[PDB]
Amino acid sequence: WAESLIGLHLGKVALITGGSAGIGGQIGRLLALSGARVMLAARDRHKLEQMQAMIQSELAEVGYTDVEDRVHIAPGCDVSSEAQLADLVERTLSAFGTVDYLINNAGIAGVEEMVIDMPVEGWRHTLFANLISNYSLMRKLAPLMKKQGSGYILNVSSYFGGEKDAAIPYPNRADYAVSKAGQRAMAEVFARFLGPEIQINAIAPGPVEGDRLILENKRLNELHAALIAAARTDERSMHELVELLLPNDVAALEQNPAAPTALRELARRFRSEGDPAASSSSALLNRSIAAKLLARLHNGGYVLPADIFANLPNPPDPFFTRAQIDREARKVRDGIMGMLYLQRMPTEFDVAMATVYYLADRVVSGETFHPSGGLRYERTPTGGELFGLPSPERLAELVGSTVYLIGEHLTEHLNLLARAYLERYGARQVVMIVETETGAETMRRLLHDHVEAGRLMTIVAGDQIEAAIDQAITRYGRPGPVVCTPFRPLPTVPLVGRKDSDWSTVLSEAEFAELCEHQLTHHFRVARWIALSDGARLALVTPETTATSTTEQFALANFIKTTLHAFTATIGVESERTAQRILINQVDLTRRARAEEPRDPHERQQELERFIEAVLLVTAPLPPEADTRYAGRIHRGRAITV
Amino acid sequence: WAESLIGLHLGKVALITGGSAGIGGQIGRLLALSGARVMLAARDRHKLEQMQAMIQSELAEVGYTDVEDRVHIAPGCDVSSEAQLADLVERTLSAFGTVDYLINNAGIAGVEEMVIDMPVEGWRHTLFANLISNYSLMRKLAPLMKKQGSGYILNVSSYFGGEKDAAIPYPNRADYAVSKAGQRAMAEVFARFLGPEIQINAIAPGPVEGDRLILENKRLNELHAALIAAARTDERSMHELVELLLPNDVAALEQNPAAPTALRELARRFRSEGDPAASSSSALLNRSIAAKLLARLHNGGYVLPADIFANLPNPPDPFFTRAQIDREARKVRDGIMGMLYLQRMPTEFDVAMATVYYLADRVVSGETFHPSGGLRYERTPTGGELFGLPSPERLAELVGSTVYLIGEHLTEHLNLLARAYLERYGARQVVMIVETETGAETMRRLLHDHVEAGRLMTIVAGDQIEAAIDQAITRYGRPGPVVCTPFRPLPTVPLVGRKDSDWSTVLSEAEFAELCEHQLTHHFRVARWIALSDGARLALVTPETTATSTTEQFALANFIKTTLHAFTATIGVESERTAQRILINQVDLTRRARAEEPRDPHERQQELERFIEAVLLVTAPLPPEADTRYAGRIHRGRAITV
Numbered sequence A, B: 001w002a003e004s005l006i007g008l009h010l011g012k013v014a015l016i017t018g019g020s021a022g023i024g025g026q027i028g029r030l031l032a033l034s035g036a037r038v039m040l041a042a043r044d045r046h047k048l049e050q051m052q053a054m055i056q057s058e059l060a061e062v063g064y065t066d067v068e069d070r071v072h073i074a075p076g077c078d079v080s081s082e083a084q085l086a087d088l089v090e091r092t093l094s095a096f097g098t099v100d101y102l103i104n105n106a107g108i109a110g111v112e113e114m115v116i117d118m119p120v121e122g123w124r125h126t127l128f129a130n131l132i133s134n135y136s137l138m139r140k141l142a143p144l145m146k147k148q149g150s151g152y153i154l155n156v157s158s159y160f161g162g163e164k165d166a167a168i169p170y171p172n173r174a175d176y177a178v179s180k181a182g183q184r185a186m187a188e189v190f191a192r193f194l195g196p197e198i199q200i201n202a203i204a205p206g207p208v209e210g211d212r213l214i215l216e217n218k219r220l221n222e223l224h225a226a227l228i229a230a231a232r233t234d235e236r237s238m239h240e241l242v243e244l245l246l247p248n249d250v251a252a253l254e255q256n257p258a259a260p261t262a263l264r265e266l267a268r269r270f271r272s273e274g275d276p277a278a279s280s281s282s283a284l285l286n287r288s289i290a291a292k293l294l295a296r297l298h299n300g301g302y303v304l305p306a307d308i309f310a311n312l313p314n315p316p317d318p319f320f321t322r323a324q325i326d327r328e329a330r331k332v333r334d335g336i337m338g339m340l341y342l343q344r345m346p347t348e349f350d351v352a353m354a355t356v357y358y359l360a361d362r363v364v365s366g367e368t369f370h371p372s373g374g375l376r377y378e379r380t381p382t383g384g385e386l387f388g389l390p391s392p393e394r395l396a397e398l399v400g401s402t403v404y405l406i407g408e409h410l411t412e413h414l415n416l417l418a419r420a421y422l423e424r425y426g427a428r429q430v431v432m433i434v435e436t437e438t439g440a441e442t443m444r445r446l447l448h449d450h451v452e453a454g455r456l457m458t459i460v461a462g463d464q465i466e467a468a469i470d471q472a473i474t475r476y477g478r479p480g481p482v483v484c485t486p487f488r489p490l491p492t493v494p495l496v497g498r499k500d501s502d503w504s505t506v507l508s509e510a511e512f513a514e515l516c517e518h519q520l521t522h523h524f525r526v527a528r529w530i531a532l533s534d535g536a537r538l539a540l541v542t543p544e545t546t547a548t549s550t551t552e553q554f555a556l557a558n559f560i561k562t563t564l565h566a567f568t569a570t571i572g573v574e575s576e577r578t579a580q581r582i583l584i585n586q587v588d589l590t591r592r593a594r595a596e597e598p599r600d601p602h603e604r605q606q607e608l609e610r611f612i613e614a615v616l617l618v619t620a621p622l623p624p625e626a627d628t629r630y631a632g633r634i635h636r637g638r639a640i641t642v
């Protein structure tokens, strides 16, 4: 079986992150069998040493000599650590000289929560481990690769990272989905810069065979929605409503005449549509669900003590039995199985084998290979240019609305939008949330007339966008339309260096992390906070490309547009599963080609009008009667191109 | 080099169409080296025999014995011939028993003309050779494959067939582009039906190294546009305007005071921006350009004798010299080269090698592998669901408009659209072009009030849609909005048979050809005729999928939607290069999933309103002042999903 592999990658040096187990261990093993010298990177030393022993023993069996020199290890390597990525490169280069193949395989699961329950630092941690680490290792190894005249960067993405011009929602996994989409987007935009010397592609396998949370999240969403629904028609404070759950008795809450209908019917739902073995039938929640519920309520603006769930009775272990956990696991399994065309789940070996053959192909770059797959999962095509504007009736509902505009560098766009909302659509007020005081003054000067009239308010967010949104809520009231534009423009730095250059001017690893902060994390933070604000319609706006934008800005803007589509599509689905169920969509100011951009003042006037129409389309209210299952999914998680 | 291939496809029987040269010859050669018994199909016997000798000799060199039994040939096999496809299967099955691998490699260039110059029979011929042939061979071999428990269908598509949720315009190659898109769409929709036993994928390579028309087409478009522009501001008939070109002297036409400015300036353009070696500087045209110009004029409604260009002086050979032909070939070459990320053109061998490794992957189906590529070419994302309606100003321009509605089975949609145009938007008249008399009566009854008032006219097209459009032009005047819906619904037949069944009820090869006739050729014929009608805005409407549509109808509807996007995107670009430069876009009534469809009367009301808005968006007039380079490409070749 291994005879087909002999001599396939002979003379090549491969660096494989996550190389001690899973798909990475298999890629490392098969690349070594192919004749390549491999460096396996992971955290645990023991696991790496056991894998090294397995590979070396198998190389000896097929006939290799000096097997110790063909398989090396790098323990204590956490890809989320920049310093650890620098030691990895130094250790690899010291053991084998230049790296031919960079296999960016490591990929953590992430937070595994809905965006509204996802700590900001958790999201950043996933981006560091799964995405930023990929640019970082490329940045260190691409100069060597270019100098020797050849190289290969392979990012191990997922089917769940979507595709070119198509986003895939991955609910409870937004951080993971975005990082996967970014690995693919990187290969797509860096290919023209890394070529002809370096190839850069992605692999996007579907689910693979190898090495409860949908129910625990269901319990959280159910309690939260009922608490918010009961708050609508009950005089008691959220504090007093939460107190009804404090005995943590499902039967008592159901039989409580003093408890609101929404909470009584929820307890009836828990007991009837529940397993009598699992304590999720007798108890309302555990402290993990309680802390998440409290954080949702606190983020939403409700006042409750931090210790409200301190004296909460811990449901005697288990809170969920062995039976109900395996039942949902089998429900998930048959779901994944029933999505697979071939209905025979691929293995880690299958993906690695198909990947090791694909690495031999020298005439592809900027592509996403699917070594396994063909899933029945739903796609959100992203990039529709043909759209008009909402009906005049939906536009008439903007009369007296409260608008939040978030931004700083897109001053012409912010001024135009603010004026369109107040002058054309009779909005009551616009709250301009900027980053800096200079940004606030620039906007107050452009909108002097509306500032004087009390129609345009300014707030300086700095790096505290959430607290700034709370200031706007308390001071000016909850918003209808929310337009989130980036504070920062895209950098104008080289993305590759000259063959014999030091690469000292090329976009650094810290600058790539900053790009993600300002162009991805900025929108995530706004969305996470606004998703709990009832009646909000959020437009996430990507940076602007023009006919004069640099070639590097086109690449970085297209990297952001694709990566953010994964976020927009994921949160679009997540919001339909919440009580507030707001609207979230993406408006793209980035295009793929310079030739498509306006070339004169008339075409620019046309473009800026299209921007206003696209924002109005996604910020016009969707009446509750019109928010059907059919129309609801149509008005969430979409992306349109100006 | 071939040692990696030994035993890779050992025990497999492969049938390769177009197996005597190109990518097919290479796939056949490498599959045989891999241990497979191969059957090479093509037309020329000699070519097949030389390839068979090359492969057999190479198999003997690497160590195989009885090389005559491993490589067979099927000469006189034209894939556009159904009877020839049936002999191919009988001959293959008789030589090797069951076929394991169907390599649908054969693919003719096609007509290599713009849609407006493409004979209807030429387009059908490309569809027969490149697309229908693929279903036909699958239909014959899939029953055997299912019975033995395994099989593989590989359609050799192109980068120019686009991608899932993304269309690629290929100007002058619409027939070719559609056939390539269809090969991919087939793999995408048949995968869930052919699995678990059979794998079905596509390969989409970019341009490959192996074995004038943009200039000849430029000469045709230039003469045509100037003749139409001169007709606008000149009293003389088209006959009399064409007569000015009869001496076929560029210098005389330039120096002719009696000739219109557009024609004089065209001759100045030909001589100045022209090569003095090539007769395209001294002569206006040849009879190939003259016949095409005449057919355009005749199709457009101009009266001219068939013999107008009979006594035309043939420009002494050459009409285009060796120098100017090679100059444009190098302009094309560097264009393709400057599109390639790696800037090193792949070879036929490279594609075949990457394909032969990919065929070993057992855990993929419904995918499109790119064995070479990563082009800088432009994409039209297809399937935007978020759109509103045109501005009230653009909608006000519909007052007094002439509307053509083409259809038959979508009676509710036709009645609704007709009523929306006449009742809401004050259109002067609607011309309902049906297929049959029963269809005309159904519509006259649903629209009784508008028929009585003289606002709704009916025409029965039968299989003469062009002559029916001419009848509408002469009788009711040229149209503004044109809504082209299919006459026929989608069939309700099985797409696969049971393991031990005869497959006698499964969609036949003739029924698959009929599906293409009614769902692809129907729109092509309308578009080809309407593209020369000044002021027209054409909506090409795909069939309807509902919550109750069969699983086979979902597959066939999605096959059509994807395949037609290639057409819409191609003609969208072609129209911008003509004098009439009409609008052409696609409105999709087909969705990917049943869950997305309306489930109640309120959701259906919403869906039908979305249909009206989508049609209005693409049929609202684009004022000439607003038809800039920027906005013009935005309003052509798009597809939106209802």
Ligand SMILES: NC(=O)c1ccc[n+]([C@@H]2O[C@H](COP(=O)([O-])OP(=O)(O)OC[C@H]3O[C@@H](n4cnc5c(N)ncnc54)[C@H](OP(=O)(O)O)[C@@H]3O)[C@@H](O)[C@H]2O)c1
Binding pocket: A017, A018, A019, A020, A021, A022, A023, A024, A041, A042, A043, A044, A045, A047, A077, A078, A079, A080, A104, A105, A106, A107, A108, A129, A156, A157, A158, A159, A204, A205, A206, A207, A208, A209, A210, A211
């Ligand atoms: N599994 C699937 O179904 C599937 C499908 C599509 C895509 N993918 C992608 O395939 C890749 C590999 O997935 P897998 O299934 O093989 O995962 P896995 O089994 O969890 O990965 C295990 C390997 O990753 C290492 N690792 C984990 N966290 C690390 C960190 N922070 N830094 C460095 N190494 C780390 C592990 O060792 P230590 O813990 O000792 O560090 C071990 O070597 C990922 O990029 C994933 O997104 C997987």
Ligand SMILES: NC(=O)c1ccc[n+]([C@@H]2O[C@H](COP(=O)([O-])OP(=O)(O)OC[C@H]3O[C@@H](n4cnc5c(N)ncnc54)[C@H](OP(=O)(O)O)[C@@H]3O)[C@@H](O)[C@H]2O)c1
Binding pocket: B017, B018, B019, B020, B021, B022, B023, B024, B041, B042, B043, B044, B045, B047, B077, B078, B079, B080, B104, B105, B106, B107, B108, B129, B156, B157, B158, B159, B204, B205, B206, B207, B208, B209, B210, B211
């Ligand atoms: N070349 C590229 O750059 C490129 C790029 C992307 C996709 N493709 C696709 O790759 C495939 C192969 O292309 P290629 O470049 O190898 O083309 P090619 O050189 O023109 O194909 C030659 C082979 O096709 C056979 N053939 C031609 N017309 C046929 C017909 N009507 N019936 C049966 N066999 C026929 C030829 O023999 P006879 O004339 O004797 O029949 C010969 O065996 C096609 O499907 C094409 O669409 C090609």
